[PDB]
Write a structure and sequence with these properties.
It is classed as lyase. This protein has one domain (1-63, 65-178, 180-380): Alpha/alpha barrel (Glycosyltransferase). The chain is built from 15 helices and 4 strands. It has helices spanning 9-17, 25-39, 96-116, 119-134, 169-178, 187-206, 208-214, 219-234, 238-256, 264-267, 272-291, 308-315, 334-349, 357-364, 373-376, and strands spanning 62-64, 68-69, 81-82, 146-149. The longest helix has 21 residues, at 96-116. Sodium ion (NA) binds next to loops.
Length: 380
C-alpha cells in the first residue's frame, strides 16, 4: 500500500491487483494509451512563454487571471475587465497551460507506471519533472509572486488567486509517491522535488501574495489550506499539516457552509453549480488527506449544523433534475457538472457509506467504463 494522501491508498492497491479484471481492464487500457500519448509530448517549461514577469526572470511562473479580458471601451483594452466564468484564450500565451500539461502528464505517467510496472513511463515522468523543476536552464522558481497577473491591474504583480493554478500538484505528489520504486525516480530526484516543495511552503507561509490567498473567504482560501497540508506532508512537516487540519473546520467549513448547506460565495457565481462542486471536491480532498493522519474532517459539525454533509444535502436534489430547476446561474458545462456531481457522491460514500450516496450517483451517472475515475475512486 503506497503512502498516498489524496488517493485512497488501500483501494488503489486493490485496483492494481485487479487491473486485468473485467471491472478495471478497460480503464487500465485507456490509462496506458494516455501514457503512450504522454511519451510523445516534449516536456514544456516556464521558458516557453514569450513574455517575462516584471521580475525580469523568465524562470518566474507567470499566468493571467483567466476571467479578465480587454475592455473594448478603452483605447488599448486597458485595464482588463472581468467576465466571470468566461476564460480569455490569451491566458495560453503564459505558463498556466504548460504547467497543466506537465502536471497531467506526470500524473498519467506515474499512474501508468504503478499499474503496469513499465519503467519507460517513470523515465518519461522524471524527464518532465527535471525539465519543469530541477534543470537549471529551464526550471520554475518555487513561488507564485506573478501568478494571475492582470493587464493594467495590480501594478504588474500577481495575486493570491494564482495559488489555485498549482492545485493539481496535490495529486501529482501522489503520482510521484507511486513511482518512487521506479529506477528513474532516484533518491536525487526525490530530494530535488522535496527541496522545491520545501521552498514553496516557505514562500506560502511568508509571502504577502500567498497571504492574500490564505485570507480568501471562498474556494480559494479552502484550497490554500489543502495545498499547504499536502505540501507540508510531502516535505516531512507533519506538524504543520496537523495544525492546518485541526484549524480547517472552523476556518473554512463553518465559515463557507451555511446551516442549510448553501455555500453562498460559490452560489453567487456565473458557474454556481461548478464552484459548489469545485469546493466540495476540495473539501473531500482534505477529508482524504486528514483520514491518513486519523483526523475526522468529514464529520466535523458546527453547533448550528454546518458540515460537509449539509453541503452535500443541498446539492443532491439537483442531481438528475433539469437546469430549469436550479435557481442559480450555470452558464456552461451543465452536463459535465451533473456528471461530476455523481462522482462527488462516490467519493462522499467512502466517508458515510450508510447515507446511500453511491446509489444516487449510480442512478444518474453515464460515465463510460474506461474512464480513469473508475480506477481512482473505486468501490474496493
Ligand atoms: Na527509485
Amino acid at each position: 500500500v503506497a503512502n498516498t494522501r489524496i488517493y485512497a491508498a488501500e483501494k488503489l492497491a486493490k485496483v492494481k491487483e485487479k487491473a486485468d479484471s473485467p471491472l478495471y481492464a478497460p480503464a487500465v487500457k485507456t490509462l496506458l494509451r494516455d501514457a503512450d500519448k504522454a511519451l510523445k509530448m516534449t516536456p514544456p517549461s516556464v521558458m516557453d512563454k514569450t513574455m517575462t514577469a516584471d521580475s525580469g526572470d523568465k524562470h518566474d511562473y507567470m499566468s493571467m487571471g483567466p476571467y479578465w479580458w480587454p475592455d473594448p471601451s478603452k483605447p488599448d483594452g486597458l485595464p482588463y475587465i472581468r467576465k466571470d466564468g468566461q476564460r480569455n484564450p490569451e491566458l495560453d500565451k503564459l505558463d498556466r497551460n504548460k504547467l497543466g500539461d506537465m502536471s497531467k502528464a506526470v500524473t498519467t505517467l506515474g499512474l501508468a507506471y504503478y499499474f503496469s510496472g513499465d519503467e519507460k513511463y517513470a523515465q518519461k515522468a522524471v524527464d518532465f519533472l527535471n525539465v519543469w523543476f530541477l534543470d537549471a536552464k529551464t526550471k520554475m522558481n518555487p513561488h507564485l509572486t506573478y501568478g494571475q497577473t492582470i493587464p493594467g491591474k495590480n501594478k504588474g504583480m500577481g495575486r493570491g488567486a494564482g495559488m489555485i493554478d498549482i492545485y493539481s500538484f496535490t495529486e501529482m505528489i501522489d503520482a510521484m509517491t507511486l513511482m518512487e520504486n521506479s529506477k528513474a525516480f532516484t533518491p536525487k530526484v526525490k530530494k530535488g522535488m522535496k527541496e522545491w516543495f520545501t521552498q514553496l511552503v516557505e514562500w506560502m507561509q511568508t509571502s504577502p501574495v500567498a497571504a492574500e490567498e490564505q485570507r480568501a473567504k471562498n474556494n480559494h482560501g479552502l484550497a490554500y489550506d489543502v495545498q499547504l497540508t499536502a505540501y507540508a506532508l510531502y516535505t516531512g512537516n507533519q506538524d504543520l499539516a496537523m495544525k492546518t487540519i485541526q484549524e480547517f473546520p472552523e476556518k473554512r467549513l463553518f465559515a463557507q457552509i451555511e446551516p442549510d448547506g448553501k455555500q453562498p460565495l460559490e452560489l453567487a457565481r456565473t458557474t454556481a453549480l461548478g464552484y459548489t462542486i469545485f469546493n466540495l471536491g476540495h473539501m473531500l480532498d482534505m477529508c482524504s488527506i486528514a483520514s491518513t493522519l486519523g483526523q475526522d474532517i468529514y464529520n466535523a459539525t458546527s453547533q448550528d449544523g454546518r458540515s460537509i454533509t449539509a453541503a452535500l444535502k443541498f446539492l443532491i436534489p439537483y442531481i438528475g433534475k433539469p437546469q430549469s430547476e436550479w435557481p442559480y446561474q450555470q452558464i456552461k458545462e451543465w452536463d459535465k457538472k451533473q456528471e461530476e456531481a455523481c462522482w462527488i457522491l462516490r467519493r462522499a460514500s467512502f466517508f458515510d457509506p450508510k447515507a446511500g450516496y453511491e446509489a444516487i450517483g449510480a442512478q444518474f451517472r453515464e460515465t463510460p467504463a474506461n474512464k480513469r475515475i473508475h480506477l481512482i475512486y473505486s468501490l474496493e
